[model samples]
Target: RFLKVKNWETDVVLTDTLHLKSTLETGCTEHICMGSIMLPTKDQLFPLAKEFLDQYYSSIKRFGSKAHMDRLEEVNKEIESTSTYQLKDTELIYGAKHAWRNASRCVGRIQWSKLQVFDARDCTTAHGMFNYICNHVKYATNKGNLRSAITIFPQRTDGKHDFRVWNSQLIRYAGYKQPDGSTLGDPANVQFTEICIQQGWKAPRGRFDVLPLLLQANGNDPELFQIPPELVLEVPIRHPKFDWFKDLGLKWYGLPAVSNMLLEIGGLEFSACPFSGWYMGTEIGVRDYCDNSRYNILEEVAKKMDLDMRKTSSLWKDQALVEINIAVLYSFQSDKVTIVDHHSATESFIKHMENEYRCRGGCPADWVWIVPPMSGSITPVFHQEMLNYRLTPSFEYQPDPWNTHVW
Candidate 1:
């Protein structure tokens, strides 16, 4: 059931199961796996494009239809003549939805089919990208009732000239390197925040000041644009039972919009397709707040709760995390913002996996992610054996725009 194919760029034979089509070679080897790195595009272009078109046509139950054949030939000739091809609006939408579905790290794939795709391939300027991004953020935030959405910018035409979003997320806090050697905001964003400052942004240095958009269009010098304040929806974290939790001064953005992934479809790559979905409670409560590299508020919350920090047997850390997690869910609910508890999210992911297996015989899942960071054994996904693999049309990481931007 397995076959070996030689890599086009390297003198290496990669082995894969016959069930999965080998479109690209990844950084995985027999002994080790680099699961998060981007997979290089396969050397064959038209054949890969045809494979995607076939999948698309098959999905609509029209693989052998004349319309499908015509479209396939049209794409083939277009690529042959111009060394590139454009996806139709409908195709782009379908590709975006499939990209979410194929995203192994996301536990929210149950809502993949509901993604709202905003096609911005015609955009030609950094200001235009900022406008499209704002519109995407506004529409997706939906006044705190967040929606799963993506705004796909222009495809990478000549590799050197790519339209890209510099921010890791559409709405994230700026980090300033304080003189005392501590970060004032999200440490995760310190490098980007520094880049923004170098580009003439005034840093207010607030704990949660939302970073401005750094947009690169056609590989030119990147430009920075501040997001309109009204478009950003924030949920202040407060426990429903513990009134003192409100005084913690903790809050999070309603829309969790990832802005820096490359969207691949039919051998074409959209370098900037900012995507947003409602937060899963643990993402904010456990990861963003408690991660040592992030805000690291667990100790403060534990101290307030009067748990014995010196005694691991007291389970101070665990108790504090639970409270914060509860507060996150409570605040979002109280504020009429969309959020999913970790339990419910894992439950739905089980259903999504079942549906995928029934439909396609396999579901690519990164078990490390499908399980919540806290209460691993308690979640449904924690018990399930999941296989992880790369699939396309998919969202993959790419080099930071500034690293490669000539200007």
Candidate 2:
């Protein structure tokens, strides 16, 4: 509940709060901004349920029709008898898509309406969750022609009965803490990799080993399931001009499936809904590989190119960054993997914002995230001022289950 734009010359202020209907308290205050923090779920779900039901009916242009009234009354009565109510299949699908649409951090909202939502709310076991996950991987991967999709498990019935996936993404490289205090794989996943090892995963100790899926069902101990190799598509980064780029042995998974985000729909929280989309080139080239905490390959690539490393005046890092990003785009395209360059992605996002503003009056966006990590000023979004706020049916960060584990 905290975003405002104040005009300096006119002495006027504008707070865009019309679409911000979520009651979840942001850790933000008048003097502080915690826009990136994980928000707590609502304590009361009944009121939210009614609000969502009304939205659902209105979405179908059947507001106050007999069918809409019957569905609303049914949901009200069901919640009255039981603590929680079930969303119909159609409602679940719409909610899932809307969640993507409301995701402020994602630059891929142009394709939000095209998401293939898989309803797995009936899953009762961890193994069932794994099976559904594998299926989702296969369909979303689509043999490298990636598709945006989500597999939603059951909504949380209570603290003890919640379903969850421990991994940040459906597929990611393991990070092994080495004997010399160096990381053998992705440094970002070192802690999670150790947890997987403790749970009986035999780490290959390689630079790029896909981590196993850790599925927790019914609030029980999380179970580890190895994703089938055939279902995991990968692309090896190689520069079109510099053949030596292949010597770095850089590779990345084709699917960008995030498994740990909590999906909140109309006040209902699904703790284990994993969603995937094709990667933007910079996500792999800039953040995943070039970030110091990630692969940290910028200096290495620059060294390989024999750039002047002694001075920042040489702009060696910039040259290496451009080459690596080009390598990533070339590699994915060479492998026929679905990927969008940051330029095209941002342009499409601008179009999406235009469409959203026309339909809903305004679009909520986190400018820092919407701008690409590299070449920020070159993108239109970098110049456009944005107002950030949380909206319903959004994908939100939740506390890691392991931090407060009962097991």
Candidate 3:
């Protein structure tokens, strides 16, 4: 029953504007009304901004090609002028630059097939285009050979996500596994193990919903994931051979000269051997056979001729015959006691020769003979004195204007 507290007992108070302004702004009274009034305006502008930005980015992406093409047209017109001599070289360089720029744009745009038509004036640049095409569009993993390119991107494994992933993993994993259960500890093996863990080896069937989501979390595996439909513009490198140097009418010879020559096409980089002699009897035997024999011979010929192997093989000549015995009496032994692929062996040999004798001007030497596997112990031996010649990179060259430019 204490003294009764009146409902309006508290003293009325007003705050300073400076302190109250923030509170007032945060309050849901007048500010709320103001926000409600602006809501429609904000909604309308947001989509407009997004659309503008999208268009802006697209425009910027094409700007380089557009500018280059415009300059090319102007230069072409000037070539017809009587003062052509004054700017001929400049015009040629500009033309090549324009073509290459356009080609690069085409690659970014996913127009890979178009790269095939790009003039080989700058073989290095054109080769870059070719590699982009093969990697993105054609799915050509094998070096420049179209035979390997054609069957790479077949449409057989549709609708099966996890199954395909597992299959690919199995192929890569089993290939690297040793006779024991232990893994080889290779990158490919580690990737496969991670994939397995992500899929949950013993997880119940219904526990996993979408296979693709799991795969996405595992990291985007292009071999497992389906190619997006929107990337239609991206075309594959469909050139029969990625021989830009030859296409440019340049003589491909010697190491330094060849390397410099291929600058336009992308210089020769070593790749893993396709076949291992240890796995000779398996499905990869054909590859091993060709690589160890035919390909080896070809490499020898290339060094001798000082010609780019990717371009032509007609220049090399064989002189003396060499033989070796692989019989029980004289078995051949490798330096390393491990599986080695033809590519790796070839690269190793080439590197050795390059370092040891400065052989073939640090380029791959050509092959002199193509030997078939035989049951005999005796192998013939041969030697030939190579024709000595020196070649240089030609700086005074221009690509044809009328020819179509691919990627």
Best model number under lDDT = 2
Rank by TM-score, highest first.
Answer: 2, 1, 3
lDDT, each prediction = 0.84, 0.86, 0.23
Model 2: per-residue Cα lDDT over 178-295, one tens digit each: 6798888899999999899999999888999999988899989999888989999999889999988899999998999888889988677899999999999999999999889999
Tell me the TM-score of model 3: 0.19
State candidate 2's TM-score: 0.93
Error of 3 at 379 (Å): 9.9
Cα misplacement distance, residue 292 of candidate 2 (Å): 0.9
What residue runs in model 3 are displaced by over 4 Å at the alpha carbon?
1-191, 199-283, 286-407
Model 3, span 1-407: residue lDDT tens: 11111112223222112111111121135435322231112233333223322323343464336654554455345434522212233332332232222221011111111222222222122223233332332332121222111101101111221111122211121112346664332322344444444545431222111121111111123223322223212111111223331232211000000000011110111110011012111112222112442112334323543654444444332210011111101111121112223333333432332242231122112222211133212221112111111111001122221121111
Q: What TM-score fits each model?
A: 0.92, 0.93, 0.19
Least lDDT summed over 10 consecutive residues: which range in candidate 1?
5-14
117 in model 3: Cα distance from truth in Å? 11
Tens-digit lDDT track of model 1 for 108-196: 99999998989888899998998898889889888877888899888987788888888999899988888898988898999999999
- The per-residue C-alpha lDDT of model 3 at residue 272 equals 8
